[PDB]
C-alpha cells in the first residue's frame, strides 16, 4: 500500500516528502502520433532533492493502463507509439529518498486524425 510513516523506526533527521511536479504540457508541434511533453520543476520542493522524473501513459480515457515509458532527469520526453485521432492520458511525478509522491493531473492530448483509410 503506502508508507504512511509506518515501519521504519528510530529515524534520524529524515527529510520531508517531496511535492507533485507541474502538470505535463505540450512542447512544440503535436504530430499525428508523436509529441513531446515537458513539465516544469517543483516551485516548492520539500526537504528532499529530486532523484528521477518517471512518467506514465495510458490509452486515452477508457482502459486504465499505466506503464513506464521514460526514465531519467530531463524534464522532457517524446511520447512515441501514439495513435492519431484518439485520446491519451499521461501523468508525471518526481522520485526522492521518500519514494514517489502523488502523481500530476491527467494530461489529455488529442492527436490529429490524418485523412487516410481505416478498414479498407
Which residue carries 484518439 as its cell?
A: 86
End-to-end Cα distance, the chain: 47
Here the CATH number for the domain that contains residue 59 is: 2.60.40.10
- Lookup: cell for 35: 509529441
Residue 87 lies in domain: 24-102
Cα gap 105→84, rounded to integer Å: 22
Where does the chain break, by residue before each gap (C–N > 2.5 Å)? Answer: none
Q: Where are the beta strands (DSSP E) in the chain?
A: 25-31, 34-38, 52-59, 67-70, 76-79, 88-96, 99-100
Amino acid at each position: 500500500g503506502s508508507s504512511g510513516s509506518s515501519g521504519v523506526v528510530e529515524f534520524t533527521t529524515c527529510p520531508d516528502k517531496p511535492g507533485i511536479p507541474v502538470k505535463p504540457s505540450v512542447k512544440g508541434k503535436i504530430h499525428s502520433h508523436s509529441f513531446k511533453i515537458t513539465w516544469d520543476p517543483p516551485k516548492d520542493n520539500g526537504g528532499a532533492t529530486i532523484n528521477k522524473y518517471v512518467v506514465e501513459m495510458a490509452e486515452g480515457s477508457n482502459g486504465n493502463k499505466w506503464e513506464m515509458i521514460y526514465s531519467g532527469a530531463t524534464r522532457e520526453h517524446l511520447c512515441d507509439r501514439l495513435n492519431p485521432g484518439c485520446f491519451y492520458r499521461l501523468r508525471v511525478y518526481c522520485i526522492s529518498d521518500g519514494g514517489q509522491s502523488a502523481v500530476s493531473e491527467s494530461l489529455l492530448v488529442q492527436t490529429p486524425a490524418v485523412s487516410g483509410p481505416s478498414s479498407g
